[PDB]
Amino acid sequence: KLVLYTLHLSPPCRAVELTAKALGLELEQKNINIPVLDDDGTIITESHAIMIYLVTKYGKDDTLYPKDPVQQARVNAALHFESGVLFARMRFIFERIFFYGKSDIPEDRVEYVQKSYRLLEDTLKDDFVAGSKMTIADFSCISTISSIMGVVPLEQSEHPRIYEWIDRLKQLPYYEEANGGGGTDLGKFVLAKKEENAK
Amino acid sequence: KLVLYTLHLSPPCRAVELTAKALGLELEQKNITIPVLDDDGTIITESHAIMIYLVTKYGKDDTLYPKDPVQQARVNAALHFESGVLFARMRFIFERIFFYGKSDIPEDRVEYVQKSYRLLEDTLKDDFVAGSKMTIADFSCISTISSIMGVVPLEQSEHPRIYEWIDRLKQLPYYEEANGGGGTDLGKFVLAKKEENAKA
Structure with a gap:
């Protein structure tokens, strides 16, 4: 499943949250100890790259x-x-x-x-x-x-x-x-x- | 043919030129938000989008x-x-x-x-x-x-x-x-x- 290391105040984190919801995906959000996506051990960084990745993989x-x-x-x-x-x-x-x-x-x-x-x-x-x-x-x-x-x-x-x-x-x-x-x-x-x- | 409205001094314009050259493509550059690519009627704008487009079409x-x-x-x-x-x-x-x-x-x-x-x-x-x-x-x-x-x-x-x-x-x-x-x-x-x- 999809883990997001995130801060909700953060605009690129929210861009990804919006994307996850539009795709019908569930996000387990975690505070840092951004955004950083952990898709089953594979780390994806940078909000635009993450969004493209999520649509490509899960759309x-x-x-x-x-x-x-x-x-x-x-x-x-x-x-x-x-x-x-x-x-x-x-x-x-x-x-x-x-x-x-x-x-x-x-x-x-x-x-x-x-x-x-x-x-x-x-x-x-x-x-x-x-x-x-x-x-x-x-x-x-x-x-x-x-x-x-x-x-x-x-x-x-x-x-x-x-x-x-x-x-x-x-x-x-x-x-x-x-x-x-x-x-x-x-x-x-x-x-x-x-x-x-x-x- | 590939037409690029451009200015050589412009970094995003040069990013596209590097891309075209790396792909073995010829560009016709015209002096003029740039660069704008005209690909046989197809209009693409913004350098990163142009680059991805070119590699996708001609790679x-x-x-x-x-x-x-x-x-x-x-x-x-x-x-x-x-x-x-x-x-x-x-x-x-x-x-x-x-x-x-x-x-x-x-x-x-x-x-x-x-x-x-x-x-x-x-x-x-x-x-x-x-x-x-x-x-x-x-x-x-x-x-x-x-x-x-x-x-x-x-x-x-x-x-x-x-x-x-x-x-x-x-x-x-x-x-x-x-x-x-x-x-x-x-x-x-x-x-x-x-x-x-x-x-x-």
Whole structure:
């Protein structure tokens, strides 16, 4: 069976949890002593690689990660947008607060994230980030957005496509448990730590 | 035929060129979010997705991108290492110099890049980034490293594995044309731009 070494506050861990639930898989989650998957002794690391692996090994169809090279290319592109832009820019803010005891968020880092929101809005021409169907790229993207939006405000009037997209994902029965709670809490924890650092 | 809208200075563009050369493919490059591949009407975008697409369509074996889910997972992880860590941290530095007229590189961004160097050194337990065999993840990582190492010094004594891996890649007949020249020139262009910015 599938063991996940994980922290629920962690966005890439939640991206995997979302994936495991969409595949109908049960995850035994373990705290560290991320994410790291133990599939029967075989160790898989890095959230995107894990998600691809899980769909490849355990998907009964390929809707979450297509076999067709062209369709698959669009999901792959979206996965790298998440790692290269969405996650990278959030981490640029969070790390300074979490590990280096800083209390300020530099203005240009807020702006870098605000720009990533506009890029995301632009990609949401269809209902989901890689096209008309929901894929693991949506899981990767929402695990990050649901965390950072509690820190760098994501304006409803300026991002209608993103809120519709979030509302779609919130219609998944497993959304709140696999992702929503943890992402909301990660935002609150960043804000609490930011304030604590200044004391 | 394969058409690539591209800029040779761009790391993700060079990662694709290395891939095309390794597959024995010819590319028609057009000067322009890049690169964009036009494969007989089929439009693929984003370098990692292009690379996987090309190996999938035109690969004669699965060396560059394995069919084995576990091995493929190692390559996938290294690809996202390149996108989320190496490239992103390079961009945090270059954008400031290119678009905002800055001449300094903040100390924390330098260390951020040097930390990515340590992580890469750590992953090179075998000869290549995803193991003992060369893959498109090597092409992705080297396209970025060959550019940033000209700006944020990568010390030999502290990164022997990186210098060994680089020397291995330099043994590829197509390395210098597809990547080496453009990565070195991007680095020099960054330094030149940085100096110019400080001059009133």
